[PDB]
Design a protein around this ligand. Sequence first.
Ligand SMILES: [Mg+2]
Ligand SMILES: [Mg+2]
Ligand SMILES: [Mg+2]
Ligand SMILES: [Mg+2]
Lengths: 164, 164, 164, 164
Amino acid sequence: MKEIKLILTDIDGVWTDGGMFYDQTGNEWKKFNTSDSAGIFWAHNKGIPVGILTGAKTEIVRRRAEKLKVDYLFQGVVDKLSAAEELCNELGINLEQVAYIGDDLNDAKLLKRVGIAGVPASAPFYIRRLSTIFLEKRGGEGVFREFVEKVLGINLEDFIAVIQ
Amino acid sequence: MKEIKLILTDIDGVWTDGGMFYDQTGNEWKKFNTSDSAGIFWAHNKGIPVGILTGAKTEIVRRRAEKLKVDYLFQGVVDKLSAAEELCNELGINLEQVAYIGDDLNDAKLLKRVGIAGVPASAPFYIRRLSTIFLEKRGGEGVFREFVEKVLGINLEDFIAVIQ
Amino acid sequence: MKEIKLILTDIDGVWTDGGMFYDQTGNEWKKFNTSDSAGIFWAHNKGIPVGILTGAKTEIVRRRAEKLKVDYLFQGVVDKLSAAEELCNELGINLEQVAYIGDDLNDAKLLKRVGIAGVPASAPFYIRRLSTIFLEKRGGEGVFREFVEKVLGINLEDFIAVIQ
Amino acid sequence: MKEIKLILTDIDGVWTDGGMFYDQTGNEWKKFNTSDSAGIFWAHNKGIPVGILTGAKTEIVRRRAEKLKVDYLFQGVVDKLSAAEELCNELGINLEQVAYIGDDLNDAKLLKRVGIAGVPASAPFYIRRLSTIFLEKRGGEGVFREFVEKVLGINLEDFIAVIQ
Ligand SMILES: [Mg+2]
Ligand SMILES: [Mg+2]
Ligand SMILES: [Mg+2]
Ligand SMILES: [Mg+2]
C-alpha cells in the first residue's frame, strides 16, 4: 500500500446512497451511516487528515462534518480537482500522496489524478472504471470506511491494538 | 437510437422507489436519488428538453423539478396521454419522437403510444411488458438516468468529452 | 380462489417494511409504497371493500387510510380477531369469506381463521407458515397489492379493460 | 443454550442499519423495525430483563426504549463493558449469564466477555468474528429479535402457546 498523507472524500453517493429527502416545506435530509465514522477513526489513528469535498452546500453536511471531526470541509466546490490541488499545495503534498473516493461525473477529473482512486459499487460504470482499487460496498453502506481501511492497510493487528 | 425530441418522465416509482413518507402532522417526503440529475444533464447536453408528468401535485416535486432545471412541469395530470399530446402539439413534434418512462396503471396509455417506452424493473408485470427497452434499474435507483443514457445512446466517448 | 367479500390488512410490516422513524421531538413517520394503492383500486373495482386493523393508533395511518379511500379503519386494536369478527357480523359475512394479510404475532389468531391468509416474505417463520397462498414480495415492496391481485384473480384482461 | 439472565444490546447498527438522518435544522432521526419489539416480548415472556447500552444519548432512543418497555437504558456510555459489569453486580449476576449483541469497535471488549455474543451480518468482519452464534439478519432487519429467539431457544411450541 503506497504512502498516503491525505484522504479526500465526496459526500452524496459515497457517504450516502444518493438519497435526497425533500419534505413539503423546503427542508432536506441526508442519511449517513455510523459505520463511516470508523473511517475518520482509522485515518486519525494513523495520523492522516481527512477532507470532504462537495458540490452542494448544506447545514446537513456541515453538522455531520463537525460531529465526525473532519480536518477539512469544502462545500460549494465547483472544481473538485482544483480544490484538491489548492489543499495539497497548502499542505505541501502532491495529488499522488492523496486518496480520493467519489461516485459521479464531477469527481472523474480528480479521481484520474490521485494516488489511490476509490469508487463505490453503486456508482455509474464510466466512473467505476476509474477506480484503482476495488470497493465491494455501495454508497451509504460504509464504503467510506471500506476505502479508508483498504488505503491504510488496516488489519487484525490494528483492530486488536485498539480494543485492548 | 430513434430520433428523440422530448423526454418525458413520471415521478413516483421512477424517480423514487414508490416511497411516500407520512409524519404525524400532515407533512410528507419523497426520497430522490442524486444520480437521476445526470439524466437532465445528458438530455441538455444533447439539446433535448425534459418534461415531468404526475398525477400528484406537491411542493416536494415542484422544488425538485426547479432544482434540476427540468424544462416542463405538469402536476395534477388527470390524463397523461393527452397532457403529453398537448406539449407535443405546443412543440410541433410527434408522440413517436417522445421517450416516456412510467411504472404504473395511469402511465399505460401513454407508454403504448410513445416512440420509446421505459418501465423500471420494480414496476408491476403488466406495465413492465409495455416497456420497449429493457431497464435493469429499479425505481429510485437511478432508473431515469439509465433511461436517458439508453434513449440518447450516451457512450464512453460522450463521457470522456464532458469531463475535460 | 374462494368467494371473498372483505379484504382485511395489517399496516406495519405489510404496507411498510416495519420501519418506524422517530425524531428528537416526539414526531413519527412511516414509509408507504404508492404501489399499494393499486390494491385498493382492484378491490374496489371488483366490488370488494378493504379494512385496516392495527394495534397502533397514529395520524400517519388515519391520513393514509383516508387518502387511499379505505372502507374501514380500526386502530388501537388489541385483539385483531375480535375486531374482524365484529366487522364480519356487521357486514353479514363470515371469516371464511375474508382475506387477511399480516406479518407478526398479533395477526396469527386471525390468520388461522380466515378464508385466505397472506403473509409477506419478510415475516418471521412462525407467521409465514400460516400463509395459505404464497407471496413473493416483502413488507413495503407492494405486497398488499400482490395479495389483492392474487386473492381476486386479477389478470391481463382486467388490466386491458381498466386502462380504457 | 447456556443459562442467560440478562440480555444487553447496542442501538445503532443493531436496532437500525446504522442510518442517522440529519435535516437542515439540527433535528435527527433513527429508523427502527417493529419486528424488534418481539425480542422484548420473548425476553419478558421468559422472565429475562433487557438492557440497552449506547454511547450516544438521544431523545430518539429514550422514546423508543419507553415505548418497548425496556428494563434498562444506559445512554452516554463511555465503556460498554464496565456499564455491563455495574449492572451485573446490581442484579447479582455474572457476565457469563449475559447475552450481548453489538456491531462495532466500542462493542468488542464486552462481546469477548459475555456468555453469548451476537453480531449482525452487516457488521465489520473484525466484529463479526467475535459472535459466538451465527446471525443471518443485518442491523435494522430484526437482528435483535433473531438474537433473542436463538439465545432463549424460542421454538414452535412457544409460539403456539402465546397465540392461544
Ligand atoms: Mg456524488
Ligand atoms: Mg408512478
Ligand atoms: Mg405488523
Ligand atoms: Mg453500533
